[PDB]
């Protein structure tokens, strides 16, 4: 399923309930049905044509509540429906999809940083815990390549991380991979062709514009062209062989900037602006609604 880039939730002054969809074919944004509960630091993904908003925190005028929610959006009806909740709240979560199943990775609850990981079965509306990561990680980037799930960077409560690890589902087992060249928490992580990209993030001192990619075959990370804007807590997704990065915080502004990376030319371009600047959104790609 692939036609619109959906952005759900986020933060500007407080957590947001926005669901908006961008159409790269015509440059158009649609406002869709609001999330039932505002959240930022959530992740998005799509399975069987449904959009899922996972985890996050409602950082609101009347409190901060970490979310264990899994909510499902149907583009055919333009409606949100609650799905089964995770075992635990997970703010600044990372999510990946392997073979129709959603993996929820790390994230925080209050002062605790999770190494736990759980897997959702859409057909059964059920979550189950799997092997935890080797490291506690929040603000972790996650991507899936060749039916293996990668957890990249993050913050363990004490240090931001350049480390990454890979989960082999048939062995329910995590293994370290080559660390990134840069410490990144809150980076955008995604897969394009045979490569895992990690774009932006925060290294403990600055929001980053640098972008590196891991070749699973060579087990090395190599920098590619940097983004035009430094940004952390950005949203990221892939559409038609190009990476799109959405919003984020640059140490000064909550960005409305959307940039697109073309791997053929190794260039980033500005493609559009979100309707308002914001960080911590969940992003995914699926069919247009009605």
């Amino acid at each position: 399923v692939g036609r619109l880039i959906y952005t759900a939730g986020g933060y500007f002054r407080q957590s947001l309930s926005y669901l908006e969809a961008y159409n790269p074919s015509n440059g158009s944004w649609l406002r869709l049905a609001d999330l039932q509960v505002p959240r930022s630091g959530l992740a998005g993904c799509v399975v069987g044509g449904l959009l899922y908003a996972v985890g996050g925190r409602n950082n609101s005028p009347d409190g901060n509540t970490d979310s264990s929610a899994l909510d499902c959006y149907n583009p055919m009806t333009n409606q949100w429906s609650p799905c089964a909740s995770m075992s635990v709240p997970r703010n600044r979560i990372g999510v990946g999809v392997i073979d129709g199943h959603i993996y929820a990775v790390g994230g925080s609850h209050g002062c605790i940083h999770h190494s736990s990981v759980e897997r959702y079965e859409p057909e059964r509306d059920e979550w189950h815990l799997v092997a935890p990561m080797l490291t506690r990680r929040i603000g972790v980037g996650v991507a899936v390549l060749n039916r293996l799930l990668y957890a990249v960077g993050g913050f363990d409560g004490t240090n931001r991380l350049n480390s990454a690890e890979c989960y082999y589902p048939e062995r329910n087992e995590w293994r370290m991979i080559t660390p990134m060249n840069t410490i990144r928490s809150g980076a955008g992580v995604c897969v394009l062709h045979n490569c895992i990209y990690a774009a932006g993030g925060y290294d403990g001192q600055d929001q980053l514009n640098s972008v590196e990619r891991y070749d699973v075959e060579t087990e090395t990370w190599t920098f590619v062209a940097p983004m035009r804007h430094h940004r952390s807590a950005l949203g990221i997704t892939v559409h038609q062989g190009k990476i799109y990065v959405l919003g984020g915080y640059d140490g000064h502004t909550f960005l409305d900037s959307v940039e697109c990376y073309d791997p053929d030319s190794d260039t980033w371009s500005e493609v559009t602006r979100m309707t308002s600047g914001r960080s911590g959104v969940g992003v995914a790609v699926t069919m247009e609604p009605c």
Partner: peptide
């Protein structure tokens, strides 16, 4: 302010 996501604190 959280320097990773810009949120208050």
């Amino acid at each position: 302010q959280n320097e990773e996501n810009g949120e208050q604190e």
